[PDB]
């Protein structure tokens, strides 16, 4: 029979170092594509362009902090004859002092200058350093870009692994995270790792890895992060500093190295108008003329 009809049946019922920093420059006046000058010239013959720099550090608990804007680098592990724009001076000083660091800047802003200070520093500490680049093609790029710079640089890839016994190693995150799970001996000689393209952690497929690897990476190692100009970067610094218990600096800038000109091209039209200048000021009325143009075109553009 059924025992389970007894349940169907009826009852018988009756934060630190946060500041905005100013820096500027001057650029020659030019027409670009429009018929006159894009911006007002200076009286000297330039056009002056200014930009903003932000820094903030995530403090560890029980950590007595000295400001890095008070710091002086007595000797460089890596030389630079040019003018150190103080978003670069702020962060290399942090790497000079021995701290984890985020760089949130443009691709041409100068993230190459800063992170390479950590490479020769381990070489000036007789230690091994690791560069993590996301793409094989970048890995072969950053191998060639750094092996010609120091020579003690190696490659590990899924495709081709050359010189695992080098002092520096251009390699991937997925090389690195697997060697954490493999428990690799190279992880012993590390005090510094560069993270290229840190804003790739937003990937729906691979963005798990840039998070999961960092928590698997030790609290000893001070880190180097190259990320894009991003708005929510300081909450990420909370995520760094909590889990490693070491200070994490961020470097934000809006610095645009080459001056850009934004033109709108109508299909099967000719009127090609500056709508956003070098100074990011939207030309509303040129845009009005761009839309009022509306009632193989590449050959018009190229020649």
């Amino acid at each position: 029979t059924d025992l389970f009809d007894v349940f169907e049946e009826t009852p018988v019922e009756l934060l630190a170092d946060s500041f905005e920093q100013e820096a500027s420059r001057e650029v020659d006046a030019s027409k670009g594509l429009t018929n006159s000058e894009t911006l007002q010239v200076e009286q000297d013959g330039k056009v002056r362009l200014s930009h903003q720099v932000r820094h903030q550090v995530a403090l560890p608990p029980n950590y007595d902090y000295t400001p890095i804007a008070e710091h002086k680098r007595v000797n460089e592990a890596r030389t630079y004859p040019f003018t150190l724009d103080p978003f670069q001076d702020t962060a290399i000083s942090c790497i000079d002092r021995g701290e984890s660091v985020l760089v949130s800047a443009h691709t041409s802003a100068g993230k190459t200058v800063v992170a390479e200070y950590a490479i020769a520093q381990s070489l000036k500490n007789k230690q091994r350093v690791i560069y993590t680049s996301p793409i094989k093609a970048l890995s072969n790029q950053k191998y060639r870009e750094l092996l010609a710079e120091f020579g003690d640089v190696g490659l590990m890839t899924g495709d081709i692994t050359i010189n695992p016994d080098a002092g520096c190693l251009v390699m991937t995150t997925e090389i690195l995270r697997s060697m954490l799970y493999r428990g690799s001996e190279v992880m012993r000689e590390v005090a510094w790792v560069i993270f290229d393209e840190v804003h790739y952690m937003r990937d729906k497929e691979r963005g798990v890895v840039w998070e999961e690897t960092i928590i698997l990476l030790p609290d000893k190692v001070r880190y180097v992060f190259l990320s894009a100009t991003i708005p929510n970067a300081m909450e990420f610094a909370e995520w760094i500093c909590k889990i490693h218990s070491q200070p994490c600096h961020i470097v934000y800038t809006n610095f645009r190295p080459t001056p850009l000109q934004h033109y709108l091209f109508p299909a099967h039209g000719d009127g090609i108008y500056l709508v956003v200048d070098e100074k990011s000021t939207f030309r509303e009325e040129n845009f009005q003329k761009a839309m009022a143009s509306i009632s193989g075109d590449i050959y018009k553009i190229v020649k």
Partner: protein, 288 residues
């Protein structure tokens, strides 16, 4: 010549050369792995005057140009033929301009649609996008996490950036939680405790008479007594009390618009009742 023998005659290699002999270049992933880099060589050697590239040469550093030209306002990203937003476009704007080589950078976009100005202010003068992690779970991860003994599969979960806003939302509420703990303690001291035993009876008044409202209201009842002119307490849904009324008439709500709407026998009969308490700014002109 670095390739092997039979590989030196593949047709994709053959037809890509005389374009490059014109200084005309194509860069996408469907090319061979060797054909990716050597075109980037001659672009970095500058002998390629025009490049037609796929979107990953955005990532390819150490090779900028002067002018980046877009032919496409929208791009099918697999799911939507969407307008490119700002922080997408700024990294798409990040390719133009060589540093000491070019005085300016030129950005041109082809269009055949009527763009509104906030779109250009939203695309060209747009803001950067949020780095928010997409941490999920993997089966190869779990057996690895059980393998590495000193760490746990929970241990990665402890420091997660996937759970971060729900972590950040708590110090917002703990500020509000701390307020109300003291805001209770001032009204904690009752001058007589019997109001609680009263309250459990007083809410039982509003609790046990609450059932009878669901019992007085029976769908096929209060019938053979709704002749017109009868006094009636008028309170629609227990929340809009129109006082004492007088029955005008009633009629069945026979819904011929779609007979699939079957009314309960409260709803299936529509009664008119005159009440004298309707507010002066009530829309008399809108009820049917």
């Amino acid at each position: 010549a670095l390739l092997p023998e039979t590989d030196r005659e593949l047709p994709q290699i053959k037809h890509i050369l005389p374009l490059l002999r014109r200084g005309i270049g194509i860069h996408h992933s469907g090319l061979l792995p060797i054909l990716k880099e050597v075109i980037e060589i001659l672009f970095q050697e500058g002998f390629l005057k025009v490049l037609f590239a796929t979107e990953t040469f955005s990532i390819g550093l150490n090779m900028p140009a002067k002018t980046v030209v877009f032919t496409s306002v929208r791009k099918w990203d697999g799911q939507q033929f969407r307008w490119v937003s700002g922080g997408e476009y700024i990294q798409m704007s990040g390719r133009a301009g060589r540093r000491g080589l070019d005085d300016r950078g030129i950005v041109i976009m082809m269009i055949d649609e009527k763009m509104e100005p906030q779109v250009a202010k939203g695309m060209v003068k747009g803001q950067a996008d949020r780095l928010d992690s997409a941490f999920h779970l993997g089966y190869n991860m779990i057996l690895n996490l059980m393998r590495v003994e000193g760490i746990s599969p929970e241990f990665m979960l402890e420091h997660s950036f996937f759970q971060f806003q729900n972590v950040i939302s708590v110090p917002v509420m703990e500020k509000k939680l701390a307020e109300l703990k003291k805001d209770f303690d001032g009204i904690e001291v009752e001058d007589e405790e019997n109001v609680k035993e009263y309250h459990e009876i007083e809410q039982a008044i509003k609790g046990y008479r609450e059932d009878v409202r669901q019992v007085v209201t029976h769908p096929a009842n209060a019938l053979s007594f709704l002749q017109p002119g009868r006094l009636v307490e008028i309170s629609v849904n227990g929340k809009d009390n129109y006082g004492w009324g007088a029955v005008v008439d009633f009629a069945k709500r026979i819904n011929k618009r779609n007979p699939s709407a079957v009314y309960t026998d409260h709803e299936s009969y529509i009664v008119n009742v005159v009440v004298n308490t309707m507010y002066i700014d009530s829309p008399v002109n809108l009820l049917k």
